[PDB]
Amino acid sequence: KGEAIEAILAALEVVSEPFRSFANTLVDVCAYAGSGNVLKVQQLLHICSEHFADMGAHQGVAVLGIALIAMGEEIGAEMALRTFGHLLRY
Amino acid sequence: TKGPDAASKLPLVTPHTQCRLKLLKLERIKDYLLMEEEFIRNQEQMKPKQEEERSKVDDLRGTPMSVGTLEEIIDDNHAIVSTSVGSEHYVSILSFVDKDLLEPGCSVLLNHKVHAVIGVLMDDTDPLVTVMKVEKAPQETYADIGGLDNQIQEIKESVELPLTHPEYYEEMGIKPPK
Amino acid sequence: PSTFAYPAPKVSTAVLSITAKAKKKEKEKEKKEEKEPEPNFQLLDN
């Protein structure tokens, strides 16, 4: 249920970083579990692309969210395979 | 090991007919493609040790580096390498070369001036052979064959099923038709 | 005196399939959320 998590992230903004970033990323990912949102996967890829533990926890949850949102459809999973390989070798 | 270098292929679009569902599928594939492009374009740009070792190795190696054939291994730091023109040279094996791969008949990489062995060429595959490898898989799938069912079943049991479900053959005790 | 003298002292992927509509929808969500007296007589010291 990704239509009722914006307030959740707003509330989570209170907690201090870097755990705040990890919590926000994980909550956002679990909000759109299987929804196949291209924009949210794009934000997750942005998060993964930036290199800073907990900061690495952000990227780990971002990759897990990429998989979660991509699992909805066959095309999404097949393309996420290539994206995951690319980000593994890079 | 050098596992399979399977040909790359994009997923298949089912609608075929120019309906908006096909447009959505192609748009999703393009979105993931742009996704990968942006990610890998930011990686190097967004990117800001081993550099010292790499520089030392490359400065010792020098360029250009000749590719020759290793004829024999005399000592742990000496070998006889025959240059491409057929002339044999008693060159010195440098430290930064895994002695395990150094076997007679391998294509060794040599310094241009002193001819000292600096690396072993792994692939060195004949260019007339590397062309044969199928990189872009053809778009014609099984649904693109009318009938030829028995034939499809036989070919699958010979070349396709053994990889996917080798359990059946292993339990039955019969090596799949190769 | 000020006028003339001592001088000096990640691209968001287009994703037009979904991204353009998403941007317009976010714009809608935001909408619902919403020298002349220059010292030409520059003074100077000795």
UniProtKB/Swiss-Prot annotation, chain A:
The secretion signal range is none
Q: Which domain of life is it from?
A: Eukaryota
The ranges of the PC repeats are 1-21
Q: In what tissue types does this protein appear?
A: Found in skeletal muscle, liver, heart, brain, kidney, pancreas, lung and placenta.
What are the disulphide bonds in this sequence? none
Q: How does it assemble?
A: Component of the 19S proteasome regulatory particle complex. The 26S proteasome consists of a 20S core particle (CP) and two 19S regulatory subunits (RP). The regulatory particle is made of a lid composed of 9 subunits, a base containing 6 ATPases and few additional components including PSMD2. Interacts with RPGRIP1L. Interacts with CRY1 in a KDM8-dependent manner.
By sequence similarity, the record places it as follows:
Belongs to the proteasome subunit S2 family.
Q: What's the protein called, per UniProt?
A: 26S proteasome non-ATPase regulatory subunit 2
Origin organism is Homo sapiens
Q: What is the lineage of its organism?
A: Eukaryota, Metazoa, Chordata, Craniata, Vertebrata
From Swiss-Prot, chain B:
Q: Which residues carry this modification: Phosphothreonine?
A: 14
- Biased composition, Basic and acidic residues: where in the chain? 47-61
Q: Could you say which residues form the signal peptide? A: none
- Enumerate the subcellular locations listed in this protein's record, separating them with semicolons: Cytoplasm; Nucleus; Membrane
Clinical condition linked: Birk-Aharoni syndrome: An autosomal recessive disorder characterized by failure to thrive, severe developmental delay, intellectual disability, spastic tetraplegia with central hypotonia, chorea, hearing loss, micropenis and undescended testes, as well as mild elevation of liver enzymes.
The annotated subunit structure for this chain is: Component of the 19S proteasome regulatory particle complex. The 26S proteasome consists of a 20S core particle (CP) and two 19S regulatory subunits (RP). The regulatory particle is made of a lid composed of 9 subunits, a base containing 6 ATPases including PSMC1 and few additional components. Interacts with SCA7. Interacts with NGLY1. Interacts with PAAF1.
Functional description taken from the UniProt entry: Component of the 26S proteasome, a multiprotein complex involved in the ATP-dependent degradation of ubiquitinated proteins. This complex plays a key role in the maintenance of protein homeostasis by removing misfolded or damaged proteins, which could impair cellular functions, and by removing proteins whose functions are no longer required. Therefore, the proteasome participates in numerous cellular processes, including cell cycle progression, apoptosis, or DNA damage repair.
The name this protein goes by in its record: 26S proteasome regulatory subunit 4
**Organism classification, top ranks?**
Eukaryota, Metazoa, Chordata, Craniata, Vertebrata
Parent sequence residues shown: 40 to 220 of 440
UniProtKB/Swiss-Prot annotation, chain C:
**Which residues fall in a compositionally biased region of kind Basic and acidic residues?**
25-34
Where Phosphoserine occurs, the residues are 17
Positions carrying Phosphothreonine: 13
Q: Which domain of life is it from?
A: Eukaryota
**Role, per record:** Component of the 26S proteasome, a multiprotein complex involved in the ATP-dependent degradation of ubiquitinated proteins. This complex plays a key role in the maintenance of protein homeostasis by removing misfolded or damaged proteins, which could impair cellular functions, and by removing proteins whose functions are no longer required. Therefore, the proteasome participates in numerous cellular processes, including cell cycle progression, apoptosis, or DNA damage repair.
Subunit relationships: Component of the 19S proteasome regulatory particle complex. The 26S proteasome consists of a 20S core particle (CP) and two 19S regulatory subunits (RP). The regulatory particle is made of a lid composed of 9 subunits, a base containing 6 ATPases and few additional components including PSMD1. Interacts with ADRM1. Interacts with ZFAND1.
What is stated as this protein's family in its record?
Belongs to the proteasome subunit S1 family.
Protein name, UniProt field: 26S proteasome non-ATPase regulatory subunit 1
Identify the gene encoding this protein: PSMD1
Q: Quote the range of the complete protein represented.
A: 808 to 880 of 953
